[PDB]
Symmetry: D3
């Protein structure tokens, strides 16, 4: 079997408000996938995070404190997934990697939010995939993949170039490259059938050495 | 100089989306008040809390996990106030009473969200006030004060300008303030003031007893 | 099998000093019950807690600090049970619900004391039973049940009335009602044979919708 | 102005049940002393600790779990002192040395219980004193001072008014103070005073060297 | 009075073994500076970090565990500085920004090691400066300042006395300072000074702009 | 099977720099031994710790802070072993006993460093062996055993005498005595084949009642 880390974008889980249908589905699918593989999840902030961050900006708070606000929101979102995962999820929002590790040992799905200023949840999932020696890293974002056109197959090296030229955070790309983490970038559409997405059946981007 | 704990209702702070105008304004008022007094604050969850809690209910989560989600939302809300209080605020959402005590020692304003399942921020505010031996508990909520019945519904609802903890317990059990918060106010005899956001526009007058809200004390 | 939360009153475990015979017995019984069911325990403060609380009262400490003292004592008592439970108990006094949850996963009996000012251990066990989605909540107190006369069967709604009219804390009753937690209230006598108490064989009160 | 660490024996604080009179009195003395000096405190377990530890022994618990139970009892005891120190006390039982340092920065009295299995509160007090670079360690225990033998038993026991760490080590190894605490006092050369509760009635005189106890220093 | 964050490179602090002379000297300089300003410090890992990280690589440990090992070494290093700062230092290695804020409130110098995998102490220093709204970030490293290329290798490397965050980003991406640290400096516009240990001999002059290093600001 | 606590001296793991060959070997052996027994490890500070401690001494830091520095170094060393133990070790350096206990339950080798000022890692391993009710305590130091001559068999009582007359810390000896923990003291040479060292085949000292 495989150890997989799923990075679910905030805008996808919370486009405006929480997308209940999508949460119901992604939760069910994650459960099925965990029947055969070891699963771990990291959730983003989305619209809600940007609203609270914007409020802090009006009070001219530091950029660091804004990140801390964005982080607290992501943990709020993660709780919605943990709820949706029922008895299969780890009860608390995992805040560090070894904790996610403990959940895996207990056969429970750990759900993380952000962890530190300066990063995005993409960076968290990448570092999580690297810490867990995960076999696969699935990034579900707001776009079909890595684009004028769409690149289907590429390597970490090629990924750092595009990032330097949205989609995926630079720190996340550095981590995916330094470790050579097989990563898959798909949109909300392919995420409607994860079970097959991990089988290579998807219309996204596959980044691997 | 007094020690005052402010209990700011979540629906006043976040009616739908965060009410930036009220946050800015109440932050200015708290700052003014803190010039002469020791100030501590507790904020509720509001509309955002109810949205996230309802989503959890749709997945049949336990009421305990729902409370935990509400607590998590109150802390995000608390961060908005901290941002508004600027350099006068204790930098981090305070999670326990002795930490709030600490912020006060440092001449900073601690801002708390929730703490434990089963309670509301109102209970948190009362326990905080009790712990700090505050001189006053000011509850800023979605109503003018304490009425004989729900003022937003019952036409016969009349405002009770003054009352003792015992009476508040009766009216509550029969809710502006919940039971636990009411029991804490009664067990310690905490002087409590219940006002709406109109009176909240001028906290220095509210503190002096110049308001149209309700005053509860032994 | 069942997931059961046992709420052992402080006065029962510590009437004056620790009742060693009762601790020996309740510990053994809890062990047997855990052979077939998932067990979790919450212990009260009793006489000792009231003595230390009274000392703080003489120094006019706040009501909140008094609760904190009562809480530290309950954790002291819980350690006596953990000791009595030997290799079957979780080594540390559980301080929060998800920790009790972890112990259950490890097949170990978690023993909690109090957790927050304003509550009683009854409230803790009720919230614990609700968090663990426990099947049964057993409250072992100083009285035969819920009394001039003794009510054998009743519902949460009926329980909130009596509490408003000792025995069980209001916050605990609110939690038992909002979730509909099947609860059993017995005295020290029935607690001498737990194995059968959970079978419905007892002369106490059964509160359930 | 000096920095002083007070090591209050658990059997003096809780002979059987908590000794309210001694607690009240020692709290007043500590408060007076804190007016001119920086004060920190460590308290032991006493009779309650022995009761709970003996119960654990009856269930064949390891000695490590027994120590942990003792530590837990010392902290409940520490809360009684904190309650007695009122507004002068750091609100929470201090669990590590740097936190005690912090309380001192805030002009408050930190009160510690135990910290780690294997040690006694005496060792905790010595390490605390060493960490804070205290000028003085005052041990208030169940004996008049340090004797050539147990004064409660041996008739030839004679009190040694003054001695050096080395001597205390000899007398201890052969116990008013345990080995580890003694080794810490010797490694750092901490000026230590050992008195009973009679001399504890007036700490300002004790601090000046006016007591009938034992003074240990290099 | 200013608020200054000092980013002391691990290879300057521990070239091979800890450089006691530099530690002693930089501690004296920081102490002098702290007389008039609020000072906070972050230190790197150096040679010891690379040794322990290389050992981990030989056992095929993940890059995340390697970072964690580096962080652990930076904190041991931070303890050497704290020891050097004596009574002016916050007693414990600070692990998060709000704790550093706290040390500053207590008129003490917080010293941080690393915090999270993926970052370097340079990033930590920038985030710290951003969080404290520091007036200045002083990077003391193994080079004279910022050059057009590696001065220890490329012969055409020329020092750029002044530049804007954007330029630093270009030069870095093409490293005195790493990308993340550079992005943080650019997002907030933190006035940053990059000097070697020669200029570090006199921080009061460095602070005034009297140095031969590089100054980065919007 | 047995529950064994291994106390690896700092000078042995770090004579000057980290002895990579020895780490590779001790790690492999610990892994094999854990195939049949429950294993737990405590690592010392060695040369590196003495260097950092000496630096603090030059700045006249307190003896307590020096211990804290020595402690942080030991945790640095423990991370090298955890790395060398790969997927068989507990991911984080265990800082307290019940945490080591949790690792055991998860079938993972917990690696501790120091824990509190005033102690040595020998004291930590002894208290750990006592907390875990370990069957055996193996102390790997810089000397062949307990010496002019070498005592092969002895009792805790006899061990406290020699310590009062290096090798093993007094607090560690008190703990080994008060609990009667069967202890084996060997040098770096015997530690080259742990699997047999625990079988009684070694040229060291066996301290037991």
């Amino acid at each position: 079997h495989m150890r997989i880390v799923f990075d679910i974008g905030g805008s996808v889980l919370v486009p405006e408000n929480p997308d209940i249908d999508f949460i119901k589905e992604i939760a069910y699918q994650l459960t099925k996938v965990s029947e055969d593989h070891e699963v771990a999840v990291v959730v983003g902030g989305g619209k809600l995070a940007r609203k609270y961050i914007e409020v802090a900006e009006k009070f001219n708070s530091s950029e660091t404190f804004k990140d801390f606000i964005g982080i607290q929101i992501t943990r709020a979102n993660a709780m919605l997934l943990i709820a949706a995962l029922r008895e299969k999820a780890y009860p608390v929002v995992v805040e560090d990697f070894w904790e996610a590790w403990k959940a895996v040992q207990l056969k429970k799905i750990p759900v993380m939010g952000g962890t530190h200023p300066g990063h995005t949840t993409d960076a968290v999932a990448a570092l999580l995939a690297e810490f867990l020696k995960a076999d696969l890293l699935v990034v579900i974002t707001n776009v079909d993949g890595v684009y004028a056109k769409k690149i289907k197959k590429m390597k970490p090296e090629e990924l750092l170039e595009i990032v330097g030229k949205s989609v995926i955070d630079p720190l996340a790309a550095k981590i995916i490259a330094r470790s050579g983490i097989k990563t898959i970038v798909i949109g909300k559409e392919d995420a409607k059938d994860l079970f097959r997405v991990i089988k290579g059946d998807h219309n996204g981007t596959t980044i691997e050495p």
